mmCIF file of all heavy atoms in Angstrom:
data_model
loop_
_atom_site.group_PDB
_atom_site.id
_atom_site.type_symbol
_atom_site.label_atom_id
_atom_site.label_comp_id
_atom_site.label_asym_id
_atom_site.label_seq_id
_atom_site.Cartn_x
_atom_site.Cartn_y
_atom_site.Cartn_z
ATOM 1 N N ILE H 4 22.018 -44.924 27.723
ATOM 2 C CA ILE H 4 20.998 -44.094 28.393
ATOM 3 C C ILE H 4 21.074 -42.754 27.678
ATOM 4 O O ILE H 4 22.188 -42.225 27.472
ATOM 5 C CB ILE H 4 21.313 -43.885 29.905
ATOM 6 C CG1 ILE H 4 21.472 -45.206 30.677
ATOM 7 C CG2 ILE H 4 20.224 -43.008 30.563
ATOM 8 C CD1 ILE H 4 22.213 -44.960 32.058
ATOM 9 N N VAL H 6 19.867 -39.057 28.280
ATOM 10 C CA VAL H 6 19.288 -38.114 29.230
ATOM 11 C C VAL H 6 19.816 -36.741 28.889
ATOM 12 O O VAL H 6 21.028 -36.571 28.706
ATOM 13 C CB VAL H 6 19.644 -38.517 30.697
ATOM 14 C CG1 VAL H 6 21.159 -38.757 30.880
ATOM 15 C CG2 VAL H 6 19.153 -37.454 31.669
ATOM 16 N N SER H 30 37.310 -45.702 33.861
ATOM 17 C CA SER H 30 37.565 -47.122 33.624
ATOM 18 C C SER H 30 37.189 -47.986 34.833
ATOM 19 O O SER H 30 36.678 -49.097 34.651
ATOM 20 C CB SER H 30 39.027 -47.347 33.230
ATOM 21 O OG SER H 30 39.385 -48.720 33.259
ATOM 22 N N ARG H 49 16.760 -41.042 41.409
ATOM 23 C CA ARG H 49 17.571 -40.459 42.479
ATOM 24 C C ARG H 49 16.948 -41.080 43.752
ATOM 25 O O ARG H 49 16.040 -40.492 44.369
ATOM 26 C CB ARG H 49 17.519 -38.906 42.453
ATOM 27 C CG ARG H 49 18.017 -38.253 41.147
ATOM 28 C CD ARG H 49 19.500 -38.506 40.826
ATOM 29 N NE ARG H 49 19.892 -37.855 39.550
ATOM 30 C CZ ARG H 49 20.994 -38.165 38.861
ATOM 31 N NH1 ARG H 49 21.865 -39.037 39.346
ATOM 32 N NH2 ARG H 49 21.262 -37.555 37.700
ATOM 33 N N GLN H 53 16.489 -51.100 45.815
ATOM 34 C CA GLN H 53 17.254 -52.345 45.603
ATOM 35 C C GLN H 53 16.409 -53.383 44.856
ATOM 36 O O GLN H 53 16.775 -54.556 44.820
ATOM 37 C CB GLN H 53 17.772 -52.956 46.920
ATOM 38 C CG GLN H 53 19.001 -52.280 47.475
ATOM 39 C CD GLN H 53 19.582 -53.040 48.658
ATOM 40 O OE1 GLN H 53 19.511 -52.604 49.811
ATOM 41 N NE2 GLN H 53 20.172 -54.211 48.424
ATOM 42 N N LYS H 72 23.644 -53.082 46.907
ATOM 43 C CA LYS H 72 23.975 -51.653 46.910
ATOM 44 C C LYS H 72 25.276 -51.446 46.138
ATOM 45 O O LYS H 72 26.128 -52.336 46.110
ATOM 46 C CB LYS H 72 24.069 -51.129 48.358
ATOM 47 C CG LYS H 72 22.709 -51.089 49.032
ATOM 48 C CD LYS H 72 22.718 -50.207 50.287
ATOM 49 C CE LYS H 72 21.356 -50.203 50.960
ATOM 50 N NZ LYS H 72 21.216 -49.098 51.955
ATOM 51 N N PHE H 77 35.268 -57.533 42.950
ATOM 52 C CA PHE H 77 36.363 -58.042 42.077
ATOM 53 C C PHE H 77 35.787 -58.505 40.740
ATOM 54 O O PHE H 77 34.806 -59.255 40.735
ATOM 55 C CB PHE H 77 37.241 -59.049 42.825
ATOM 56 C CG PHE H 77 38.356 -59.598 41.976
ATOM 57 C CD1 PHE H 77 39.490 -58.842 41.731
ATOM 58 C CD2 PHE H 77 38.263 -60.854 41.402
ATOM 59 C CE1 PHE H 77 40.514 -59.340 40.947
ATOM 60 C CE2 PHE H 77 39.288 -61.349 40.610
ATOM 61 C CZ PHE H 77 40.408 -60.589 40.380
ATOM 62 N N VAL H 78 36.345 -57.950 39.642
ATOM 63 C CA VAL H 78 35.963 -58.392 38.280
ATOM 64 C C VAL H 78 37.177 -59.116 37.662
ATOM 65 O O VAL H 78 38.295 -58.608 37.704
ATOM 66 C CB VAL H 78 35.399 -57.296 37.350
ATOM 67 C CG1 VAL H 78 34.771 -57.912 36.108
ATOM 68 C CG2 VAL H 78 34.355 -56.461 38.080
ATOM 69 N N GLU H 79 36.879 -60.282 37.159
ATOM 70 C CA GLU H 79 38.016 -61.089 36.701
ATOM 71 C C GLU H 79 38.701 -60.397 35.541
ATOM 72 O O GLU H 79 38.077 -59.648 34.837
ATOM 73 C CB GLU H 79 37.512 -62.480 36.314
ATOM 74 C CG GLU H 79 37.234 -63.363 37.517
ATOM 75 C CD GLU H 79 38.471 -63.946 38.177
ATOM 76 O OE1 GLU H 79 39.575 -63.711 37.653
ATOM 77 O OE2 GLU H 79 38.323 -64.621 39.219
ATOM 78 N N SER H 99 22.875 -63.120 31.809
ATOM 79 C CA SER H 99 23.631 -62.173 31.054
ATOM 80 C C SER H 99 24.710 -62.910 30.225
ATOM 81 O O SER H 99 25.167 -63.994 30.636
ATOM 82 C CB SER H 99 24.193 -61.057 31.925
ATOM 83 O OG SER H 99 24.822 -61.555 33.090
ATOM 84 N N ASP H 103 24.979 -58.480 26.268
ATOM 85 C CA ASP H 103 23.927 -57.887 27.098
ATOM 86 C C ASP H 103 24.332 -56.567 27.749
ATOM 87 O O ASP H 103 23.445 -55.802 28.195
ATOM 88 C CB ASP H 103 23.389 -58.851 28.164
ATOM 89 C CG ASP H 103 22.577 -59.954 27.520
ATOM 90 O OD1 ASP H 103 21.859 -59.661 26.544
ATOM 91 O OD2 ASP H 103 22.671 -61.125 27.989
ATOM 92 N N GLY H 124 24.792 -67.068 35.871
ATOM 93 C CA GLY H 124 23.519 -66.720 36.467
ATOM 94 C C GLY H 124 23.574 -65.496 37.345
ATOM 95 O O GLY H 124 22.596 -65.217 38.029
ATOM 96 N N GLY H 127 25.751 -57.934 36.613
ATOM 97 C CA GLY H 127 26.209 -56.769 37.368
ATOM 98 C C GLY H 127 25.847 -55.492 36.632
ATOM 99 O O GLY H 127 25.921 -55.427 35.395
ATOM 100 N N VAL H 131 24.386 -45.322 38.051
ATOM 101 C CA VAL H 131 24.548 -43.937 37.620
ATOM 102 C C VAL H 131 23.788 -42.940 38.528
ATOM 103 O O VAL H 131 23.793 -41.751 38.218
ATOM 104 C CB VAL H 131 24.111 -43.698 36.151
ATOM 105 C CG1 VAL H 131 24.942 -44.537 35.171
ATOM 106 C CG2 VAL H 131 22.616 -43.943 35.959
ATOM 107 N N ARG H 132 23.103 -43.402 39.589
ATOM 108 C CA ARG H 132 22.282 -42.534 40.437
ATOM 109 C C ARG H 132 23.049 -41.455 41.191
ATOM 110 O O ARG H 132 22.447 -40.462 41.625
ATOM 111 C CB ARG H 132 21.484 -43.385 41.435
ATOM 112 C CG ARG H 132 20.453 -44.297 40.743
ATOM 113 C CD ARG H 132 19.732 -45.159 41.796
ATOM 114 N NE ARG H 132 20.639 -46.196 42.312
ATOM 115 C CZ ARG H 132 20.282 -47.161 43.159
ATOM 116 N NH1 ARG H 132 19.051 -47.190 43.661
ATOM 117 N NH2 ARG H 132 21.168 -48.087 43.531
ATOM 118 N N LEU H 134 25.538 -39.660 39.801
ATOM 119 C CA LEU H 134 26.043 -38.705 38.807
ATOM 120 C C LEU H 134 25.004 -37.594 38.637
ATOM 121 O O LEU H 134 24.209 -37.606 37.696
ATOM 122 C CB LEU H 134 26.334 -39.448 37.486
ATOM 123 C CG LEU H 134 27.342 -40.610 37.567
ATOM 124 C CD1 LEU H 134 27.455 -41.336 36.228
ATOM 125 C CD2 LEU H 134 28.712 -40.106 38.066
#
Side-chain angles (χ1 to χ4, degrees):
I4 304 163
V6 51
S30 168
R49 301 297 179 197
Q53 281 188 251
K72 290 197 181 195
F77 180 77
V78 192
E79 283 283 357
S99 48
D103 290 322
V131 299
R132 295 178 288 185
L134 302 175

